[PDB]
């Protein structure tokens, strides 16, 4: 996104914000090249000269202005993908009530009761609970009034930019590449969910390569479904972007919103509008006041779905700008935000698409850091997706998500205070697929201090999850 105006205006003082992540007993064992990001200009781990306030927003390096020809091509692609999408999902995309928007529905989780409220409530000392009743599912007069401004399309707002307290690679920690979460006003999130929550629920339910989205997937069970699909194709690619979200040009964001969220597809007319408000945004960090044109806020409602949709359209766009007679059945893909796996029986030249993605302001390289990359003949067992590989389980003959051992190690190496027991169980579910030997090693440091699940227990849980029939079938016989 293009930073078009900065201001130092106002601000009182910044409260000493530290990281809640503390090392665990595993840190001393694995000695990972990972650390809690910097949350302070005076973090002693930073490199000299690095101003944290500036590096945050360094990702906003412009709003690629697409040519006329390229906009008309982008629209055709956006329409063609919207055609596939709404053919599968249907056209029951009417607004949620205020109740359903808060409480959720099948395929859409409830709004967070006590997360950040946004601006200007954080200044006024009001939590989300003061503005919205989450149990009953009603709204106080402030929200109710704000909503009715959006109906008139006169509503305006600022994004509250927080630093993301999380584990990062140490090179990025030292560089002061702390990620940010743009916290929009609770009423904006609410109304966004009203306008497109029905559609989102329906995309979660329908996750798969047909709609080209993995948002709302359960990697445990769904990896088999995804695995068997992509194994069929001669060629598979996995693609890295640099700052996918930020480099969504306003032209691409605008066209996508117009093509995907049309009233003729069952949406309220203010679906297009509320989404278009994400294009030109104002951001509030401590003292600075940065207005930005282009890019997705990231952390706004439906960020994953929106990014996923754009990713789908970009593939169609890029291919159609290079090759002739390209359609949705020329290839197949699944995406989750910037994350992407494409496959085709055609020998597509993904290296030559580099400039075609650059016309959208996006910069692509292979995840398989080949420095001499994008090659034919890669398969699903070679690629990474949601930080998971696709490996065949010998026992079942089903694909399973295998995370890299260094990543498991880093995730185990740090935790928020007094949540380690809970985090261990959660990560045990991730690490089970790495095999009994590596499982035992990863949890070796924790043995005796905390409850570690048995490899056996989690294996059996997984087999029932992926295929209940299979698990039942193993009991047709009697043992020794």
Curated annotation (Swiss-Prot):
Cell location: Host cytoplasmic vesicle membrane
Catalytic activity: RNA(n) + a ribonucleoside 5'-triphosphate = RNA(n+1) + diphosphate
Domain RdRp catalytic: 234-352
Location of the active site: 338 (for rdrp activity)
Motif (Nuclear localization signal): 16-24
Annotated membrane topology: Peripheral membrane protein
Recorded consequence of changing residue 18 to A/E: Decreased transport to the nucleus of transiently expressed 3D and 3CD and severely impaired virus infectivity
Subunit relationships: Interacts with 3B-1; this interaction allows 3B-1 to binds 2 polymerases and act as a primer. It also allows the recruitment of the RNA-dependent RNA polymerase to host membranes. Interacts with 3B-2; this interaction allows 3B-2 to act as a primer. Interacts with 3B-3; this interaction allows 3B-3 to act as a primer.
Protein name: RNA-directed RNA polymerase 3D-POL
Organism: Foot-and-mouth disease virus (isolate -/Spain/S8c1SantaPau/1970 serotype C) (FMDV)
Shown chain mapped onto the complete sequence: 1858 to 2327 of 2327
């Amino acid at each position: 996104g293009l930073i078009v105006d900065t201001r130092d205006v106002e601000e009182r003082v910044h409260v000493a914000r530290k990281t809640k992540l503390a090392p665990t007993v595993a840190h001393g064992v694995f000695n990972p090249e990972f650390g809690p990001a910097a949350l302070s200009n005076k973090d002693p781990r930073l490199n000299e000269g690095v101003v944290l306030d500036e590096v945050i927003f360094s990702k906003h390096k412009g709003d690629t202005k697409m040519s006329a020809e390229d906009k008309a091509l982008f629209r055709r692609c956006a329409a063609d993908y919207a055609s596939r999408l709404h053919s599968v999902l249907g056209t029951a995309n009417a607004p949620l009530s205020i109740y359903e928007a808060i409480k959720g529905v099948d395929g859409l989780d409830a709004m967070e009761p006590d997360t950040a409220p946004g601006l200007p409530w954080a200044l006024q000392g009001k939590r989300r609970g003061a503005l919205i009743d989450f149990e009953n599912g009603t709204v106080g007069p402030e929200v109710e009034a704000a909503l009715k401004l959006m109906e008139k399309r006169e509503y305006k707002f600022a994004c509250q930019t927080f630093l993301k307290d999380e584990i990062r690679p140490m090179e990025k920690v030292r560089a002061g590449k702390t990620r940010i979460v743009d916290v929009l006003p609770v009423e904006h999130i609410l109304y966004t969910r009203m306008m497109i929550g029905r559609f989102c629920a329906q995309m979660h339910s329908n996750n798969g390569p047909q709609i080209g989205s993995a948002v709302g997937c359960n990697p445990d069970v769904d990896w088999q479904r995804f695995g068997t699909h992509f194994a069929q194709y001669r060629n598979v690619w996995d693609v890295d972007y640099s700052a996918f979200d930020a480099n969504h040009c306003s032209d691409a964001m605008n066209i996508m919103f117009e093509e995907v969220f049309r009233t003729e597809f069952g949406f309220h007319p203010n679906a297009e509008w509320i989404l278009k408000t994400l294009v030109n945004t104002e951001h509030a960090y401590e003292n600075k006041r940065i207005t930005v044109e282009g890019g997705m806020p990231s952390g706004c409602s439906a960020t994953s779905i929106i990014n996923t949709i754009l990713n789908n359209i970009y593939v169609l766009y890029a291919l159609r700008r290079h090759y002739e007679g390209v359609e949705l059945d020329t290839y197949t893909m699944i995406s989750y935000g910037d994350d992407i796996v494409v496959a085709s029986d055609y020998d597509l030249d993904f290296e030559a698409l580099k400039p075609h993605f650059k016309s959208l302001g996006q910069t692509i390289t292979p995840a398989d850091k080949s420095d001499k990359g994008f090659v034919l003949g890669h398969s699903i067992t070679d690629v990474t997706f949601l930080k998971r590989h696709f490996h065949m389980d010998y026992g079942t003959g089903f694909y399973k998500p295998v995370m890299a051992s260094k990543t498991l190690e880093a995730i185990l190496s740090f935790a928020r205070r007094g949540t380690i027991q809970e985090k261990l169980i959660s990560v045990a579910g991730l690490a089970v697929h790495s095999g009994p030997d590596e499982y035992r090693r990863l949890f070796e440091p924790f043995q005796g201090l905390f409850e570690i699940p048995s490899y056996r227990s989690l294996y059996l849980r997984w087999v029932n999850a992926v295929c209940g029939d299979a698990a039942a079938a193993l009991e047709h016989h009697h043992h020794h």
